[PDB]
Ligand binder design. Structure first.
Ligand SMILES: N[C@@H](Cc1c[nH]c2ccccc12)C(=O)O
Ligand SMILES: [Zn+2]
Length: 123
């Protein structure tokens, strides 16, 4: 009864440079015969003031997507090659390939999520 169209074995925690625990992936390049993007992220109600990574890079462009049940329920700081940016949910920020970056949760409610959509199949 495993259905080839359904993956329940999630998240997939992958070792990623800059991170101190594995990064929780929901889409990986090896799923469904090969995917053109990867996606990782999580709920940040417990991550306010706690960054998941140091400044890091990836060989592909990465889009951050920040959502929360209430408008403006979540806020993150993103460092982009040393320059502070802030996002208020809902928001999307592009992180160019090669850019040294990371994010910090400054505010979150139950149900706030940040995802990173990696526009390629390599890390
Ligand atoms: N892949 C993302 C990681 C990420 C985005 N949102 C998150 C929320 C919780 C934990 C990890 C994340 C990055 O490189 O930054
Ligand atoms: Zn990243």
């Amino acid at each position: 009864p495993a259905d080839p169209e359904i993956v329940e074995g999630l998240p997939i925690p992958l070792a990623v440079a800059g991170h101190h625990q594995p990064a929780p992936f929901y889409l990986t390049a090896d799923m469904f015969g090969g995917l053109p993007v990867q996606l990782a992220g999580g709920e940040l109600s417990t991550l306010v003031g706690k960054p998941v990574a140091a400044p890091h890079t990836h060989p592909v462009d990465e889009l951050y997507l920040l959502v929360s049940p209430n408008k403006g329920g979540a806020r993150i700081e993103v460092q982009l090659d040393g320059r502070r940016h802030e996002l208020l949910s809902p928001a999307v920020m592009r992180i160019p390939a090669g850019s040294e970056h990371c994010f910090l949760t400054l505010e979150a409610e139950v149900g706030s999520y940040c995802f990173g959509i990696l526009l390629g199949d390599r890390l």
